[PDB]
Each structure stands twice: as C-alpha cells, then as structure tokens.
C-alpha cells in the first residue's frame with residue numbers, strides 16, 4: 001500500500017463549495033456555462049493501480065477522467081474545455097495539480113482533513129474551496 005491509497009482512494013461526493021463562480025470567472029468560463037456548471041454536485045472517484053493514479057469526476061453537467069504518474073506532465077482537456085499541460089505531485093501528503101495554458105497557470109490542491117477531502121483551487125488572487133465527503 002501507500003500513503004496515496006490510504007488517504008485519497010475511494011468515492012467522494014461534493015457537499016459544499018465557496019467562491020467557485022469567481023474561480024470559474026478567473027479561468028475564463030462564460031456566463032451560461034458558469035451558471036450550469038456551478039449547479040453540478042460531482043462524484044469524484046480516485047483510484048490507484050501501481051504507479052498510475054486516476055481521478056474521475058462525474059456529474060450531470062460533465063464527466064472527466066485523468067490518469068497520470070506523479071511528476072510526469074500530461075495533456076488534459078478540462079471540464080470547461082481548456083487544453084492544458086498538467087503535472088501532479090504529492091507534496092507533504094497533498095496532491096498538487098498545476099495546469100498551464102496560454103501563458104496562464106492554476107493550482108488545485110487536494111488534501112484529507114478529518115473525514116473530508118478538501119479541494120482548494122487558485123487562479124491569481126482567487127481561491128475556491130470544494131469540500132467532499134465519502135459517498
């Protein structure tokens with residue numbers, strides 16, 4: 001087993017959100033999409049198979065799935081249809097996901113906090129916090 005397995009693997013449901021509309025604005029999402037995307041309550045499924053981590057997000061609005069090896073950059077088409085270059089590392093027990101596109105950068109941090117998985121999303125000055133519980 002591994003730290004990653006024990007901490008993150010499983011099925012998680014969104015239970016609260018803060019500032020997500022403002023985060024979406026900062027990453028360039030337009031009005032109609034922000035409105036419909038902001039209603040979504042995704043399930044997040046995290047799995048590990050050997051060195052490969054998979055993060056799936058499933059909702060009424062969009063489904064996404066990424067698989068990656070820690071430290072190894074990959075192509076990602078985000079839920080909001082940005083084509084980014086992503087690298088995910090495990091830093092002091094926090095999954096740190098950096099996305100680069102068009103000269104811009106956003107960082108998504110995923111951490112365990114008590115029984116929750118807390119996702120912090122930062123674009124320039126704007127932070128959104130997305131809190132998940134076990135499904």
Ligand SMILES: COC(=O)C1=C(C2=[SH]CCC2)C[SH]=C1NC(=O)[C@H]1CCCC[C@H]1C(=O)O
Pocket residue numbers: 023024027029033034037042057062079080081108119121130
């Ligand atoms: C920018 O859009 C997004 O980031 C975004 C979505 C859209 S689709 C159209 C508009 C917005 C849908 S789901 C999502 N982001 C996440 O699910 C992760 C990954 C990053 C931030 C929040 C995280 C979270 O666990 O909720």
